[PDB]
Design a protein around this ligand. Structure first.
Ligand SMILES: CC(C)CCC[C@@H](C)[C@H]1CC[C@H]2[C@@H]3CC=C4C[C@@H](OC(=O)CCC(=O)O)CC[C@]4(C)[C@H]3CC[C@]12C
Ligand SMILES: CC(C)CCC[C@@H](C)[C@H]1CC[C@H]2[C@@H]3CC=C4C[C@@H](OC(=O)CCC(=O)O)CC[C@]4(C)[C@H]3CC[C@]12C
Ligand SMILES: CC(C)CCC[C@@H](C)[C@H]1CC[C@H]2[C@@H]3CC=C4C[C@@H](OC(=O)CCC(=O)O)CC[C@]4(C)[C@H]3CC[C@]12C
Ligand SMILES: CCC1(c2ccccc2)C(=O)NCNC1=O
Lengths: 100, 72
């Protein structure tokens, strides 16, 4: 009943909260697009960055199928292991990079 | 001043505090030694380089302390 408790229930689903961030980002992209360039050019760019999100939301739509669905939640768990790969790679990459 | 001063002393002697305060000085050292090698150096060392020169020898005295103040 409490409005803040309704909001806290909504933030629990991660695909739902990343909807509304991309909706507000597309609104910001619209208002710039409706202005004279270069404001338009940058709101073109904001439009193309929502494309990075809205194909990835097809992963959640793909979750209904009983085979691709477990495959999608498989990907999310392996990225926690991939983060530890990213940190160890980041040391070795910048050690070669600064030295070169 | 006695409850507050007991808080500062017990905090800055806790081992997790003494870790992350050597760690934010190592991650502060590594940023400085990046800047001096990427940017040019002249004949005399820069202000950034002199802090790096401090960090190496003061770590050297500490590394000798670990040898001398050991168990055998
Ligand atoms: C260890 C791994 C997993 C991650 C570390 C790699 C990234 C953090 C790096 C690799 C390529 C980098 C990009 C390579 C080139 C550019 C273009 C650069 O833009 C310009 O130089 C302006 C245009 C120009 O001058 O040509 C801005 C930084 C950026 C996006 C870099 C941002 C940082 C990136 C993504
Ligand atoms: C606690 C940890 C996580 C970070 C602590 C390190 C930073 C606070 C230091 C490390 C690298 C430093 C930078 C290294 C070199 C420079 C260039 C320096 O510019 C010059 O020496 C030439 C121009 C001038 O004299 O201002 C200005 C400070 C700055 C940005 C330093 C600002 C402070 C930095 C970011
Ligand atoms: C002790 C280290 C390992 C961690 C703590 C980081 C800071 C205390 C250091 C790191 C970078 C330093 C800066 C690097 C370079 C400069 C430029 C320097 O500019 C001049 O001296 C201008 C005149 C001149 O060129 O002689 C003034 C000090 C300052 C800001 C330094 C102030 C102290 C900083 C922020
Ligand atoms: C040079 C790294 C370090 C250190 C820092 C954090 C954790 C472990 C070691 C140090 O800064 N001084 C004491 N001994 C060391 O080797």
């Amino acid at each position: 009943g409490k409005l803040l408790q309704k909001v806290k229930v909504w933030l629990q689903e991660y695909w739902n909260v990343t909807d509304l961030i991309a909706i507000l980002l597309f609104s910001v992209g619209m208002i710039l697009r409706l202005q004279d360039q270069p404001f338009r050019s940058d709101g073109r760019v904001i439009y193309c960055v929502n494309i990075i999100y809205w194909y990835i939301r097809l992963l959640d739509i793909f979750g209904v199928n009983k085979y691709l669905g477990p495959y999608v939640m498989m990907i999310g768990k392996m990225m926690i292991d991939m983060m530890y790969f990213v940190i160890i790679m980041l040391v070795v990459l910048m050690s070669f990079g600064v030295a070169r | 001043l006695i409850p507050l001063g007991r808080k500062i002393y017990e905090f800055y002697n806790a081992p997790i505090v003494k870790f992350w305060f050597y760690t934010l000085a190592y991650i502060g050292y590594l940023m400085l030694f990046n800047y001096i090698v990427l940017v040019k150096m002249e004949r005399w060392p820069s202000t950034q380089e002199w802090i790096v020169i401090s960090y190496i020898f003061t770590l050297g005295i500490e590394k000798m302390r670990e040898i001398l103040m050991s168990e055998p």
